[PDB]
Design a protein around this ligand. Structure first.
Ligand SMILES: [K+]
Ligand SMILES: [K+]
Ligand SMILES: [Mg+2]
Ligand SMILES: [Mg+2]
Ligand SMILES: [Mg+2]
Ligand SMILES: [Mg+2]
Ligand SMILES: [Mg+2]
Ligand SMILES: [Mg+2]
Ligand SMILES: [Mg+2]
Ligand SMILES: [Mg+2]
Ligand SMILES: [Mg+2]
Ligand SMILES: [Mg+2]
Ligand SMILES: [Mg+2]
Ligand SMILES: [Mg+2]
Ligand SMILES: [Mg+2]
Ligand SMILES: [Mg+2]
Ligand SMILES: [Mg+2]
Ligand SMILES: [Mg+2]
Ligand SMILES: [Mg+2]
Lengths: 219, 305, 110, 115, 154
RNA sequence: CUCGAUGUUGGAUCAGGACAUCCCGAUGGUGCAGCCGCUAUUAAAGGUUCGUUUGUUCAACGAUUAAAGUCCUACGUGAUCUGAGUUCAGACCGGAGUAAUCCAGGUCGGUUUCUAUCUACUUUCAAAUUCCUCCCUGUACGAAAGGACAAGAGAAAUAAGGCCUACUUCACAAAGCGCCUUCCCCCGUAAAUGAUAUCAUCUCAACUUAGUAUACCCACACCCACCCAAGAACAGGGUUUG
RNA sequence: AGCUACCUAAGAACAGCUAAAAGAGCACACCCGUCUAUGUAGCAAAAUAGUGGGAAGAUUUAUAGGUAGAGGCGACAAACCU
């Protein structure tokens, strides 16, 4: 079972009724628009109504580098290099102007966010806008593309080698020396892994969310 | 002479029994008020220009996006009407003001934590106590019999409301956060002076003027947001969807009133008057009333063309 | 900044004896029914807690004598037995701590 | 997004904008009251030691949702009339600029790619 | 402003806080009942409950073993967690400890607590007890309850 | 008046006030067709940019702007900051002196203490300003050139006040770079009727016109303890989560 | 003249790296005190943290001795001489 990540609310003092009501609108909009399963690292094509585009329809293809937000506001960022110009668009999953979301290639990466592609070599952010969808077999495990990208020289938009980022899909061996790596470890927080009270267990939250999803589809 | 709380002297057996007893009583007091029109209501007058009706007490549930047919995104605040009842009527004569008043109450709280005079008041009304009580200036033709329930559909989409709550309390704050003072440079010699007020007056007057902006307690005061459009009413859960943001933290109580901004004067001709009575309404309202410009969730995708 | 003037004892008596600076009478003191000594309602009885602590310390000295070294916490439950007591059926396979005195009336054999 | 001293990338094919120079083109004025330029705003450039008006057609700062964000701060040189100085814009530009066809008809006319 | 901040600032910083809470939790696992300043015991109490849940995962669970190894600084207590304490609480789903305020500390007058794992072999703490059902008030309420039961049947 | 000390030019910060008004409002005149001006009466609610250069105030210059006002406040404000300048001890150049030294002539360098006793003050106060576009309209007005206005509709900026759905910094939250809301007036004159002075006359004649808030707050336990979006303490909210 | 200025007698210290003629470079110990902040009845009647200058030399430093106020001593700062 894949539950799209915007259905699991962040920890907080919000009254659960509010998430229930919001889930009902997310599920109604999903009846109109099929929102497919995707991850950071999947190649998507989004079609949107644009009052100023030619034909009043826009299509963008790119790699999902971020999925963020919760509820009806939840978004994802598609990134592509177009005529050698890097570009990215943050789409709203439930914006009624979205006409179609197509998963050209369904895959997963070694990291939950690919914002470091802004500092990787342009090839790792370039995807053909007319590439044909790859077929995904039924009841098959989602593939994890284990590409470790090569980076541009420093400085980067963020300090990707710092432990707080916990990035695994960068060829740090090529771009950073051992002394540069030793410095970054000074920000490591080994106790953080074991702080049991920081863990946010949403297993029981998801079970109830699945009952609502099944209830809406049943009726 | 020592203090006592409600369960201090109760036994292991009597504590669960007393809680069930007080809860059951409250639920049935609330259920006894669900039919105001069969209980000898006060006269239901027609709306007239210059007429002012009551508002509500709601709870701030949170914020949510919605989209209009134009494709514009608006954020809205969900205000849930939780056990709103009229509590008191004060005639124009006894109010000492130019208008009659109607006291309304919001959220059910514990009878164990309320003062006796307040408990004595609610016992005579026949309701569980409310957390917050607010006073609404009404015209004589808008009076409602105390004990009458108030609902979210008292308001309708397209209307404007003023929302009043206490702002988020930020405690003691310096001038930068409190008043937007610039502070002082970070470097270039500054000695222990980065977030300070600077001068607080001129030398000549030998004093500081009343009203001078200084460090102090910030927030936790009553503000009103004027002129918020009602985009949607969910009548099943009693949610109002007001445009934008409202003062206070989520789960706080807010006062919702027909907007007093002049543009919106005498727009209550088509609003429920004096209030909405669901028991009287012949045809039940749908679960959701929408403003005409709102893209409804199951509506087809926007397609500019 | 220094005082421009000495503060009089009359000014200082109005500050020092202000009801805000006075100690407040407590109203949550009561008698412990078990021992008769005083306690606060929300705090354990000092006397009864000490009695329990003195015996816990004695039992812990016995646990120390049996373990006989650091890093020797056992992997089974423990029972404390007093003079004239024997392991019951449910105390088999437990580490037994023997106390050379009679079981206190308040530390019931459960 | 674009303010005084921001270095911009001229993305049209003007000779002024593409000729090599020792100093990168630099915004010296934003024709907006708050002084912060966004897509569709005009700025003044110090380019090749000269002063030339330009139109912002992309920037790195996040905008509203559903709008493109570019890896560079992109401008198109214009005349005080509004007419483009070049004749081809190869790099993609936001479709939102097509809302200002009134002011920017000629500049939109030389745009090959839209995003 | 500290709205919604759920943890205390203790020790010398965030790593120091954990090391304080770890040392306390280690003592609680050895002795089953420790006394310490009230706020630290309050802060430590959440972790002592979580430690049992990891122990209930079993010693063949690699993650639970890695968690126990961090939190128990004396290693003979790691087998005690999995083989004594956790089997003791297999029936319960929570509430493995009880925490009680004891009188302020003599030297610095610090507010103090005693915390213990339930079901330990130590002499019982002098817990607070509710009034007996036989008091005047509780007998008037008992009468009230049964009168209701009678009318409820009707 | 102060030499048993009232230290500090310019800047930062925060600005109180005047009105002799720079801009926005209302008028009168015009060598005012219109568009712009010029001049005067009224108006101090609101506003009055960022840079290069100089320690600079001053000025020049580059870009703007509705406008980049003049002034006072111990040349406002240094127990809030800065110290470039300024002005002690070091040193250099030119000049003056026999020399020691000296020069509102340049130059480089050169310790800015203070735990607040009193006064005062610390959420006045929820009414908002301005530009631009469209439109009126290529109309009025002009031979043309050109070229508007009490309306109407938008879209902004700034200033207040909030808030976190999304984005962003982040992550049980606080934030801005994000979002939401913002509501009266003002008097100068211009005109009727009309006597003293049987016309006339807007009248320190009697007279008639332009032309005078609401909102918020609001009931009172225990005052054991616990919890909190409330908070320095205190107070407040919740516990029918003891 | 147990500080400090200068001197006498007789001692001691100076890692690594580069270069290799060494008042060479980098860089510790060590010596000094450029700049910033802190501190200003201090931790301190001149400090602390960082950043610095030098670090086989006109170097730094332990010991004992010498020069004395109309004086000494001085790579002149009218320096230093408890
Ligand atoms: K003097
Ligand atoms: K000084
Ligand atoms: Mg600043
Ligand atoms: Mg200082
Ligand atoms: Mg500082
Ligand atoms: Mg030049
Ligand atoms: Mg004096
Ligand atoms: Mg001022
Ligand atoms: Mg002055
Ligand atoms: Mg002197
Ligand atoms: Mg010469
Ligand atoms: Mg000379
Ligand atoms: Mg110097
Ligand atoms: Mg100087
Ligand atoms: Mg002070
Ligand atoms: Mg060297
Ligand atoms: Mg010397
Ligand atoms: Mg000399
Ligand atoms: Mg001299």
């Amino acid at each position: 079972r894949f539950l799209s990540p915007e259905f699991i609310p962040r920890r907080g003092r919000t009254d659960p009724l509010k998430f229930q009501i919001e889930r009902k609108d997310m599920l109604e909009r999903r009846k109109v628009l099929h929102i497919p399963e995707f991850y950071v690292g999947s190649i998507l094509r989004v079609t949107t109504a644009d009052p100023y585009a030619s034909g009043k329809i826009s299509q963008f293809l790119g790699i999902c580098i971020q999925r963020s937000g919760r509820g009806l506001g939840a978004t994802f960022i598609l990134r592509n290099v177009i005529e050698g110009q890097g570009v990215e668009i943050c789409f709203e999953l439930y914006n009624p102007r979205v006409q179609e979301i197509q998963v050209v290639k369904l895959e997963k990466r070694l990291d939950d966010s690919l914002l470091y592609l802004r500092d990787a070599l342009p090839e790792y952010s370039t995807f053909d806008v007319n590439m044909k969808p790859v077929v995904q077999e039924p009841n098959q495990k989602v593939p994890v593309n284990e590409l470790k990208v090569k980076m541009k020289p420093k400085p980067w938009s963020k300090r990707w080698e710092r432990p707080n980022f916990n990035i695994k899909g960068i060829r740090f061996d090529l771009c950073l020396t051992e002394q540069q790596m030793k410095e970054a470890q000074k920000w490591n927080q080994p106790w953080l892994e074991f702080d049991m009270m920081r863990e946010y267990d949403t297993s029981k939250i998801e079970a109830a969310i699945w009952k609502e999803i099944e209830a809406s589809k049943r009726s | 002479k020592s203090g006592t709380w409600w369960d201090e002297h109760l036994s292991e057996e009597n504590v669960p029994f007393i809680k069930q007893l007080v809860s059951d009583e409250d639920k049935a007091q609330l259920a006894s008020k669900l039919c105001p029109l069969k209980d000898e209501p006060w006269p239901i007058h027609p709306w007239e220009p210059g007429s002012f009706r009551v508002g509500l007490i709601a709870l701030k549930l949170g914020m949510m996006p919605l989209w209009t047919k134009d494709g514009q995104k608006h954020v809205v605040t969900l205000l849930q009407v939780q056990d709103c009842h009229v509590l008191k009527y004060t005639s124009k004569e006894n109010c000492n003001g130019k208008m009659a008043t109607l006291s309304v109450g919001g959220k059910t709280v514990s009878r164990f934590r309320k003062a006796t005079s307040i408990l004595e008041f609610y016992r005579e009304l026949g309701l569980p106590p409310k957390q917050t009580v607010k006073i609404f200036n009404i015209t004589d033709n808008a009076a409602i019999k105390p004990g009458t329930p108030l609902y979210a559909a008292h308001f309708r989409p397209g209307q404007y409301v003023d929302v009043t709550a206490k702002t988020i309390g930020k405690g003691f704050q310096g001038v930068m956060k409190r008043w937007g003072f610039k502070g002082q440079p970070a470097t270039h010699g500054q000695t222990k002076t980065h977030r300070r007020p600077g001068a607080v007056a001129t030398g000549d007057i030998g004093r500081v003027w009343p009203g001078t902006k200084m460090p102090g307690k910030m927030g936790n005061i009553y503000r009103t947001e004027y002129g918020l459009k009602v985009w949607r009413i969910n009548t099943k859960h009693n949610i109002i969807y007001v445009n934008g943001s409202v003062p206070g933290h989520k789960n706080c109580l807010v006062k919702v009133k027909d907007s007093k901004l002049p543009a919106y004067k005498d727009l209550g001709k088509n609003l429920p008057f004096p209030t909405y009575f669901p028991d009287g309404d012949e045809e039940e309202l749908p679960e959701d009333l929408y403003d005409e410009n709102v893209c409804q969730p199951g509506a087809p995708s926007i397609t500019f063309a | 900044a220094a005082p421009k003037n000495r503060r009089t004892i009359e000014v200082n008596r109005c500050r020092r004896r202000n009801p805000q600076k006075l100690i407040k009478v407590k109203n949550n003191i009561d008698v412990c029914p078990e021992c008769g000594h005083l306690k606060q309602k929300h705090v354990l009885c000092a006397y009864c807690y000490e009695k329990v602590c003195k015996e816990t310390a004695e039992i812990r000295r016995q646990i120390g004598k049996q373990e006989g070294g650091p890093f020797k916490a056992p992997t089974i439950e423990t029972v404390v037995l007093y003079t004239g007591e024997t392991p019951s059926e449910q105390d088999q396979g437990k580490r037994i701590i023997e106390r050379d005195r009679k079981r206190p009336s308040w530390f019931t054999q459960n | 997004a674009i303010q005084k001293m921001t270095r911009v990338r001229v993305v049209d094919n003007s000779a002024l904008g593409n000729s090599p120079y020792h100093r990168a083109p630099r915004c010296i004025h934003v024709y907006k009251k708050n002084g912060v330029g966004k897509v569709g705003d005009q700025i003044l450039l110090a380019i090749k030691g000269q002063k030339k008006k330009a139109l912002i057609v992309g920037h790195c700062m996040p905008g509203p949702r559903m709008t493109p964000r570019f890896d560079s701060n992109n401008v198109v040189l214009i005349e005080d009339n509004g007419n483009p100085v070049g004749t081809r814009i190869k790099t993609p530009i936001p479709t939102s600029l097509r809302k200002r066809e009134g002011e920017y008809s000629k500049v939109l006319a030389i745009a090959q790619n839209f995003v | 402003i500290s709205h919604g901040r759920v943890f205390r600032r203790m020790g010398l910083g965030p790593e120091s806080r954990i090391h304080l809470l770890r040392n306390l939790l280690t003592g609680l696992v050895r002795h089953e009942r420790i006394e310490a300043p009230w706020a630290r015991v309050d802060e430590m109490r959440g972790y002592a409950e979580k430690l049992i849940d990891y122990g209930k995962l079993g010693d063949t669970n690699e993650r639970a073993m890695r968690m126990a190894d961090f939190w128990l600084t004396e290693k003979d207590l790691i087998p005690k967690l999995f083989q004594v304490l956790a089997p003791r609480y297999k029936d319960q789903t929570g509430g493995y400890t009880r925490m009680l305020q004891i009188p302020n500390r003599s030297l610095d007058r610090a507010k103090m607590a005693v915390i213990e794992y339930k079901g330990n072999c130590l002499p019982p703490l002098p817990l607070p007890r509710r009034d007996s059902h036989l008091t005047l008030l509780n007998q008037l309420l008992q009468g009230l309850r049964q009168d209701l039961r009678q009318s409820q049947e009707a």
